[PDB]
Amino acid sequence: AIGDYPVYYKQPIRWLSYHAHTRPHVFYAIAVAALGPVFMMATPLRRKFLYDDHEPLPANGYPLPNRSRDKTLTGYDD
Amino acid sequence: MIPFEALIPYAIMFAGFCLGGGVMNSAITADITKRARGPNQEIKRNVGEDEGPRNYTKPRYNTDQWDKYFAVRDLRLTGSLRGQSDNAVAEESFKTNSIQPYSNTRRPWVLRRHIIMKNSPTKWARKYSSRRDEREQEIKDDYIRGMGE
Amino acid sequence: SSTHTNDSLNSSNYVDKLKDTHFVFENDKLPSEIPDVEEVGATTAPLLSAAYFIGAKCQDYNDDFMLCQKEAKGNGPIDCLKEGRRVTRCASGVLKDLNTHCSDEFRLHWQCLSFSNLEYKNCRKAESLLNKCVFEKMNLVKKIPGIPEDRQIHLKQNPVLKPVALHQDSEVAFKKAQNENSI
Amino acid sequence: METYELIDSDPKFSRVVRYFRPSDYLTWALGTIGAPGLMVLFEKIEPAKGNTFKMPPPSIMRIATTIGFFGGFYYAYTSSTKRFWGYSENAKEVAKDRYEVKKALSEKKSPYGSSLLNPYQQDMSARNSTNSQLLLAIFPWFNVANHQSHGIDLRKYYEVRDGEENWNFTLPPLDQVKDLDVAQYKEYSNYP
Amino acid sequence: NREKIELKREKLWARAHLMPLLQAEQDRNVVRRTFAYYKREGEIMKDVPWWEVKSTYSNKDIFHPPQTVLFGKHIDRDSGLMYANSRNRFGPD
Amino acid sequence: MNLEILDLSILGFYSLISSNSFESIAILVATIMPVITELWYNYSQLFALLYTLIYVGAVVILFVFILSVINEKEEYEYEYSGLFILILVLLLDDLDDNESNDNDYNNVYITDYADWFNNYNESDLSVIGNLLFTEYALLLLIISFILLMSIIGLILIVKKD
Amino acid sequence: MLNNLFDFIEYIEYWLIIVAFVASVLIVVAYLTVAERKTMGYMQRRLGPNAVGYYGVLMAVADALKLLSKEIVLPHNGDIIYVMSGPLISLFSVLLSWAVIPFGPGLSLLDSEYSIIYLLASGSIGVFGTVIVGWMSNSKYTVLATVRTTAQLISYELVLTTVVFIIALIVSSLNINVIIESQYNIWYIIPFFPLCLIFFISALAETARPPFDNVEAESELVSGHMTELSASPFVIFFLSEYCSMVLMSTLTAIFFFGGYLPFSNTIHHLILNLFDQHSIYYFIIEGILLSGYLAIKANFFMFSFVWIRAAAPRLRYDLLILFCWYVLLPIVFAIVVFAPGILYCFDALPVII
Amino acid sequence: MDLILLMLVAVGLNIIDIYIMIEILIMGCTVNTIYSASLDNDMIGLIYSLIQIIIAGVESAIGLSILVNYNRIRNSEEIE
Amino acid sequence: APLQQVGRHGGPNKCFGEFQRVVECMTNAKHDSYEPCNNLKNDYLECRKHKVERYKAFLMQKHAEELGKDPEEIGAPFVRKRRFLTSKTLGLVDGDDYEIGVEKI
């Protein structure tokens, strides 16, 4: 078996070597694609070790105070 | 050894971009600034003796709906879509010079004139069947009949 | 967003031609039973320059007008006329004060905005002079709610995004205050 | 109609898996090995080729186990979901659920948990995932978010039931529990 | 990108502070045109005793500004090029 | 002067006289172009560009299929028609162009009153993406499921082996 | 006069701006043909055109004028539709694409939040112009080029579109001018060096330039779809092809090299400090500098378009089909997932400001 | 003029011409949807319009593939 | 409840409020029949099409024609060309009739 096709569930490391050598357009395209979700799973580590998330933007209309109207408000009258 | 004769066409191409950039950056900026001076040609063209150094307004980009509202509002205050004014109180004319666009809501011409696109079971019913219009005319007729009570 | 609508001016006259748009005027004023008010005369650039000063001065009237709208249950335009006039007068007062106490600093700021696509990030030098002058003469401070005081973008020392072209009047005025005010 | 108490109209993916009974794992295991068994059974009933029994190739056995592994988990997931919905006997699940909620309330923590989704997205996520187990046989969809639309009232966790007096849980008012809608809109009514 | 978020927050609050005064001006404009619509309808339909001037909505508790109008003078009818031979907007030419 | 009427009249004239398959795919291009331009003005600039982005790619694939099928049939087949009858047919179709019979809806103009409550202004495409990926994410996933079926479907129909 | 002239110019001012804009693009395209021959000549140790106008500066004029004074070959005079429909569609597609190219901040004829879509959509129309020439044509070499032209479109269109979408995704905007301003602190060549190479490869494929010059391979299909073209139809197709070369070179400078942004911020301030902002001379110089920054970056890739032609042999079109689908598409699709994962991880999802 | 089925003459006498007719007919529905959505200021209708464009594109690909294989079968001897 | 009638900025459009009040009336338990909600349905359809209001405008125009009233005497002034929204029409004190600049904002 000097150049045989490795069996994935028996030699996982050798199996990855075959595609890295014979199909570079497949091995490294998946490797770049994998890092996307991988960094997404590392987000909690950044949340605790580097900095916290920004406060959400006020993209929900005018901020209305959560109170009844001030009936004792005057000024700039007619 | 740098061949300068090969670089001559690139220098002319370099001047080609500069011609467009020089004309567009200056002529457009000057036009906006000129129209922001006032509502009449005697102010846009003639520069007063007591007027200060000219401040130029650069072209606006990356706008939204709020900027469209602002442009119309500035037109009703200065006669220009980008006019300048920091007055605390607007003129009396600003009260009643509002502009409201009224327009039709008809379907595109291609939808009602294409030899193929205008044919469908529902479009034929809208165009040739009075079943929809007769029923909807009842609502219009109910409006007048409910006035006297 | 440049989507065509039936509520404002569209992108080109070809849109008007297809829509057969009529730009309709009304020659009638408000009825006499509604008290008259003086409309704000500031254009886009002065309003953006004084946006945080109007909010600081007229916060209670802004909230009261907006609380009237929510509590009107669909009848906002008619019921809240009284609250609307309070905001207009209060906002006009802020602009009037800016023309009597900080006219040089105020005009330097919104002329920079007209020079720099009305972007706040491109007129920090002029805004800083304006903010200092307003505070020392009106006791009004620009504040961005929802974030810590030291994490406000307008107070950032070394912003990542800076204007491409410097505003010469802002540069000269900024240097005139660096050496003189801070000896 | 055999009806029981409602626990959670949209239980979370982790909650469903944690509340698996020993029978749920048993049905999961039977599904995992049943699919390879059915291929053996089908060959025994009628061989694929010829007239004598021939074992299916190991490559078929590997993919059949993978199909059965997901098939068994889906069956177990549906069985556990009905206990949250109340369609199935869930007295064991009710007791475990009430203990967890009271413990979270005593710590001034939301029983649903903190979420990265804003108020709109939390409601939107609940609409997409609620009752999606009815079509789990067609295509998967799970509640993997900490939303607050679970079709229950946290008031019912304040009343003490039998066997819960010794839990010694002190429950503060809901308006003092973090990450609850009744304890977020303090300054603005449109922002939590 | 994180600075753009802070810049976005600054712009959103600046528009929020300008919103009440700009909307108050817009509310008066809508009310002014609403009254102008019913005044025009009243003048045209005054000779009809049974005609009632009202909106086409059953919900009288919700303000529905009319969105139609009757076209009058064409101000730029005589306009040529570089100059509008504008007719009088207030009354006859 | 609505020049869209003239363009559609020219397009309709060639539809009745088109003989070969190449003239038919040219009719399709002469149909999308008025749609895109009439969308670019008036109603929606966003979908005018979306129509150009998607349908132009489909036209080229349609064209390359024609080169593999043309079999001399319409290069010598005769057509009779007649100039007078073709103009008469188009003239009668020109008489009625009212797609709807609500005269009030077609003759009375309306306006909208803009408001300043939307301080957060973004393009329509962002709002479409906001709803498509959150409110109607199932539709997006099923569309991808349909796209997957097409990829498998094309291979099994076309591939010899 | 005087008063009636000082407002007539204002009435026609913006038409002069467009005419100047058209001349600016044409000059670059006209002298790109001269530059390409001069650049290849010295690389091939020849001289290139130097005997048509002083040092060869009139070479472009002579080539255009001579062809404009040539007989138009067609089966009948009424057949002017057949040999002109193709080139005109191709020329209009590339000229309209220049409307959204900003030479400075806001200095574009068309400004819109969908400028990226308009750019890609307009370019796709130009492909339809090439296939029109092969309209049941009796020329066998014209027919073979149309088949190759469609094959190349399938190669680059998916790859080119997705690369532009990644840059738009990074800025969360489809506006070209917003993309340019977003590169103030970092030029996208550094974070997306693989994409810049991929974009340039797709640009070569789109323009049918070597090593992807299978449509107009002289040693394979004499002249391709232009073998039956002469006089004006040849010029319009020749003009459109070189207009695409300038446009794609300018696009590369915009997407990855900051567009019109200065090479050095310090040098930009010093030069402009020599001019008064209260006079128009400042904005004349400012437009020269900002477009000069764009010109230098664009001229480099126009040099690179010539550079690759003089250094690489032609690749077969069937090999190109396998190249884009097996290599380019998996890579670009991998990046379109990688980029949002990075941005979300560090709480840096983009917004428009 | 529509009730006499005038559109049956505007469609050419080739199989691919029937395909073009279907694309135009479906495109008319999408244009109508954009017309209604734009007036209503409703992005839901624009979501529908986008779906109709994507779905109609899938339909064209499937139909073309059947027509491609159908043309292949007749010219399938390939003895050369 | 799925969202319907969403404006171009992500929020409710002009006619969502009418639609929302229809849904609340139909799903309210206190009602025995859908008759009380009939008036709310008409308002929502009036918000979109304005068919009744256009009909009212048709009557007013037709009524004025038989009375001999000139349309320009009882109508509203309008301008058809955006470049001719001059400062004289806008009523500015120094307003001129020269065309306004609408080429590039």
Ligand SMILES: CCCCCCCCCCCCCCCCCC(=O)OC[C@H](COP(=O)(O)OCCN)OC(=O)CCCCCCCCCCCCCCCCC
């Ligand atoms: C865009 C500017 C450059 C192109 C200008 C060319 C003008 C020619 C007409 C353009 C199409 C207008 C609408 C007609 C639909 C297509 C009909 C057609 O086949 O082309 C018309 C052309 C005229 O030649 P004729 O001999 O009269 O027709 C064959 C009679 N058996 O018969 C032919 O087969 C010649 C076809 C030549 C290639 C034309 C390819 C289509 C061009 C579409 C681009 C313009 C988009 C449509 C604009 C108008 C829309 C109505």
